[PDB]
Design brief:
Pathway: Cell wall biogenesis; peptidoglycan biosynthesis. The protein is α+β, with helices and mostly antiparallel strands and 310 residues long. The protein is 35% helix and 22% strand. It folds into three domains: 89 residues, Rossmann fold; 151 residues, no CATH class; 70 residues, 2-Layer Sandwich (Dna Ligase, domain 1), CATH 3.30.1490.20. The protein is built from eleven helices and 13 strands. The structure holds adenosine monophosphate (AMP) and magnesium ion.
Length: 310
């Protein structure tokens, strides 16, 4: 119950130049309506088409970031907004940049007791056959080969056989100077924990129809399931929500986003990444998690924006 005047003049950052301009336009237009439904003085601002300095010059005090990919997510616009004195939703420079770097995220997690798949690295110019032998010996198969980060050119690959690993390594190393090779977490399920301020949001179980939550399962298929309830017992659900929040916090992220994790057959969790720029379309996961606990869309957006006060 915040007087919408306390928010002042608000920009919704949407659109941009990235390959995810269209999810951002969709999300941002809805966010904008959510804020205006609450009587907040909100206005769209597409940084690809307006000069960024206009945020300061036109007197905007804060921004709801609905950008996705590139400068909108990686710390670059975060830094510029801090430089221009504009408060914004989501994580600051370090958290944003670190969240997109799966290598350094996993190092920090390993040092701070956040569970994450065992992994090795391969560098461009390595003896890929030699590295493959050593990695299989340590981790077995299957393996996930992914950018250290991140997703730029070469899609995540599940390697099922030792003899296929050298080629997968060489190809991944052509498009990132650091490649992560993780043990495949098998025999459980896949989950995500949405984080929004102190809201108690339920876990979601992600059930791809195919091998893993690949591009096809995310963007092509209409049959990926996003399940609430997630199927876990109350104690485990509480435990994993707590670890998810610590996993975000230790990276310097602040509490808007999602933490993604796998369970093995024994029910142990292994975190894969954080996402500091989740979607806000009417089919996106944070609005679903919020609606499951009685929080509607406009309420959710207002709550996220409230974290920029004080
Ligand atoms: N180590 C892993 N074990 C099991 N599944 C994984 C692992 N890494 C990635 N995946 C799957 O691949 C998808 C995309 O990987 P990523 O973008 O790195 O999270 C994940 O959402 C999971 O479905
Ligand atoms: Mg993304």
């Amino acid at each position: 119950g915040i007087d919408p005047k306390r928010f002042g003049k608000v920009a919704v950052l949407l659109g941009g130049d990235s390959a995810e301009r269209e999810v951002s336009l969709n999300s941002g237009r809805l966010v904008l309506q959510g804020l205006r439904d609450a009587g907040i003085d909100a206005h769209p601002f597409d940084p690809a088409q307006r000069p960024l300095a206009a945020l300061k010059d036109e007197g905007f005090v804060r921004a709801f970031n609905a950008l996705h990919g590139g400068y909108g997510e990686n710390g670059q616009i975060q830094g510029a907004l801090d430089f221009y004195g504009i408060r914004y939703t989501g994580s600051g420079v370090l958290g944003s940049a670190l969240g997109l770097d799966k290598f350094r995220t996993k190092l920090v997690w390993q040092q701070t007791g956040i569970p994450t798949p065992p992994f090795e690295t391969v560098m461009r110019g390595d003896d890929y056959a030699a590295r493959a032998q050593d990695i299989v010996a340590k981790l077995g198969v299957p393996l996930f080969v992914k950018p250290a980060s991140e997703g730029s050119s070469v899609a995540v690959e599940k390697v099922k056989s030792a003899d296929a690993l050298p080629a997968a390594l060489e190809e991944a190393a052509k498009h990132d100077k650091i490649v992560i090779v993780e043990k495949s977490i098998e025999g459980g399920g896949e989950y995500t924990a949405c984080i929004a301020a102190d809201l108690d949001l339920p876990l979601i179980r992600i059930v791809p129809a195919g091998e893993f939550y690949d591009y096809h399962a995310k963007y092509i298929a209409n049959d990926t399931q996003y399940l609430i309830p997630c199927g876990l017992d109350a104690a485990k659900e509480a435990e994993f929500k707590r670890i998810a929040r610590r996993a975000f916090d230790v990276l310097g992220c602040t509490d808007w986003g999602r933490a993604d994790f796998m369970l093995d057959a024994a029910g142990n969790p292994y975190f894969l990444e954080v996402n500091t720029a989740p979607g806000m379309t009417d089919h996106s996961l944070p609005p679903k998690a919020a609606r499951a606990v009685g929080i509607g869309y406009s309420e959710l957006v207002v709550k996220v924006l409230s974290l920029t006060l004080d």
